[PDB]
Amino acid sequence: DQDAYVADVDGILDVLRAQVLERKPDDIFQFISKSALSLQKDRSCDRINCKVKDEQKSRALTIIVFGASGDLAKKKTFPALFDLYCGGLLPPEVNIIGYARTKVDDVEKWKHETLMKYFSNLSERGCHAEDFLKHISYFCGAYDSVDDFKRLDAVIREKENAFKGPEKGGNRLFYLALPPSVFASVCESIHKGAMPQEVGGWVRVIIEKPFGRDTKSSAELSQALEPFFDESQLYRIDHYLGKEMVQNIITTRFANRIFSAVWNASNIACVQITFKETIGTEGRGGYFDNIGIIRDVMQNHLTQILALLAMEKPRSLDAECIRDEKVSVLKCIEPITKENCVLGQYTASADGSIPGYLEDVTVPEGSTCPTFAVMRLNINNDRWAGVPFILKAGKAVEQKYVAIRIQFRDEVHPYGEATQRNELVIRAQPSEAMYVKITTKVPGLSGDLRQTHQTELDLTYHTLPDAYESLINDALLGNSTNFVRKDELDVAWRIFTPLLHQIDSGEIKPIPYQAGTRGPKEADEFIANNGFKHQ
Template sequence: MSSATAASKKGDEKHLYTVVVLGASGDLAKKKTFPALFGLYKNKYLDQNTHIIGYARTKMDRSTFEEHVSMNIKLKTDEDKAAHKKFLKLCSYQSGQYDQDSDFKRLEDAIREVEKASGATARLFYMALPPSVFISVAKGLKKNNYTEDSLVRLIVEKPFGMDLDSSRELAKDLGSLFSEDEIYRIDHYLGKEMVKNLMILRFANVIFGSVWNRHTIDNVQITFKEKLGTEGRGGYFDEFGIIRDVMQNHMLQILTLVAMEPPVSLGAEDVRDEKVKVLRFIPPIVKDDILLGQYGKSEDGKEPGYLDDKTVPKDSKTPTYAAATLFIENERWSGVPFVMKCGKALDQQKTEIRIQFKDVAGHLFTTLSRNEIVIRVQPDEAVYVKMMNKEPGLGTKTIISDLDLSYSSRFSDSVIPEAYESLILDVLNGDHSNFVRDDELDAAWKIFTPILKQIDNGEIDPIPYAHSSRGPKGVTEFVAKYGYTRERQEYVWPQHSEAGSAAGKDQK
């Protein structure tokens, strides 16, 4: 048996893990990583003997660590509280530097001690860390905590570089230490329920699959809106901006799933092959196809502007809003604009995909609005199809109606897992499908790096907009330039629909 085949078979086996959370004292670990691990443990997706070791530079005693771990864990029932007590017994903490072999050796001693007690045969290293320490930590782990006797998996959080060159440098350094099969570049949007549902919607339904192309679709909008501003993170955010923070990763991942061709199978590499192919058909974004904004004070003066943050340079041109149009130059999508819009300090919290179809040919009926498929990613997960219908009564007046699948009503008894729970479980199962491959990352940065260089050089001025508004002036015209058409008649959601339906809250 070849070594590659042996490694593959080793990865396919069920393993008991020791989980090491690096950066355990930080916000990401507190808000996402530990709650996700607890969720998996509580629902018995994590082996009940799995030990979790937190590692960070901050010194914490046992009680402080337990309080930190528990801060964002929601305990709704007595069963939750009982599971939480058991979970904490499996957690331990060790402080240490990120560039000291002696500290990583002490970590190794701690790992071996719990492995002796649990019988664990695999190690999962979760790097909940800033990118500035990725490589020093990876070197420390490889030198002191990597063993050929155990299966090793490494989760790396975004951002994966700042541009094409830095991404390639990071990939090269990380690739010299761990194999691509061992690395899981996590983008938590790929773990969201409706994003995971995209392939089912597209490839398991003839009614969607047959119209998913340039012949029937006029334009596609992917929207990511946040109500919060930078909220004290301005100094950190200013290094990256909204495009690196949201568009180049989260939104582009959604675009690939909307636009990719059917994969040969559901195998991780077959899925990721098709995502890479789509990205390679997208030319770099040009200045005429982008609009930037930066939020100021709210109109009532209660909410501060971006430049009011003391950690943000007063002359900063960093965008907090961006609208960009991408074109996929292949047979399926040629000529169809994909408009991505994202921003902070906006009027609502929403992530959705809006697929708008072409106008009906001919003039049999007047005042027709276009059909749309809307996939609401968050909040209030839903899929709904906007269509024309006859208004009840005498006559043939047309109205806009909907075929609505709102999860809150259709799946009211189902619990939708958190994205991080879903993705960590994928790692434990050795499934790379929902993680970013190195060549995929390279193709993504090629699309954005030229325009990012212009933005970084101050060549594109952001348009100011008020905190809690819908965004900078000109966004409506920008979207209309690429063919998006609003309803030509009033749109009213029927009264008999379930309260809280996503379609009833439809806002552009």
């Protein structure tokens, strides 16, 4: 026959084909030619050794991703899982199963084209993807069928008992890449049929960002999940808590005495946390019309950043005392009122390239949901009294940008106008950076030592995986330091719910602004009145 050689030839054609779809229009005639030509010298080769702890290899692990046909598992969950295999963090005998109600004609065509198509670029690393796909299986069934979960458990129990390790049984990790409405039925089916083998093994369930839309809707949803799983088993991922630069916030603050001495109201004059984004709704205005920018990236993302910035020192580095301070600081904030808020809704841009938010057909006529929102929070405690906290977010803005911008009070004496406010910036995207801006005397001889200029002490990028998989590694370790807790969720909703009821009741209206600008100019007038000085 022609043994073994077939696997190498098939391992080429699937690699280009995923790039052909991502390359998209136009004609693919040249795309096949030079990409394989680039691989000739790209062709590692040593199998990556397991960096995983010896304790994790003691007994079997199973990873079940519900909604494998869903948009999140395709573009994010599974591609993140492949990234962990390249790092060796997965045990060698790991078993992955994709669960979805959709019928699948043939799994082998499906994994080669529906899942690997979103994989991270594989010109230097594509050969390892073929070995990775052997671990993946697929399981068709309903999310509410206790019978199918009794059928799925029989499949997991075989590989759990086939494991080659001193310990027996199996740990299980479920990833609910599902709409929130489906979450309750799945955990019921897991509790009635998918619980770990009695001989041993733990269970943990990851759930996705949407937790209702107000303080009451989120509270009952967690109440629905209480009977089936406790807080230690639930892992409410936030997209940003796994980010490198924001995990540094707990270290940049407390590990350094210089920052801790000035992290108080006596020195800090203003704090702002912006989430700027140049994209519009991208034709999915109805998917965003029911949300709004406040609950999309402000109640969840910027609030988690504000919690890490304003939290009191944890008693230890244990995950819960860190999260305990994250909740205690959020309880000092009185709920936002409409006087402290400014909304915006992007219109057709002067370029003519971006249709206005109302120009999209999916958006209901007369919509007042905000595409832009700047607001001030007020922390009532001895550390942060009187200090503005300006949260800002918006789509279709002048530039893609998310960063912190603390601004310390300047001491006008002696220098007066020769000096200005110090500020510490912590940027996460487009690129990670941190720097402190200060005034220093100019090198030229000048005179009176008054010829000064602003100067920054840039961190010099002292030294990969996206936060979606970095949190996946934390759930595999059981750390849970970077996952939202339910008490942390209820207080974050309480800050915004009274304001969210007012915008839903029409008491305030968005301010129009055409796309590609900074936003409504009233928002800049609002930021100027809340402690933001600038050069």
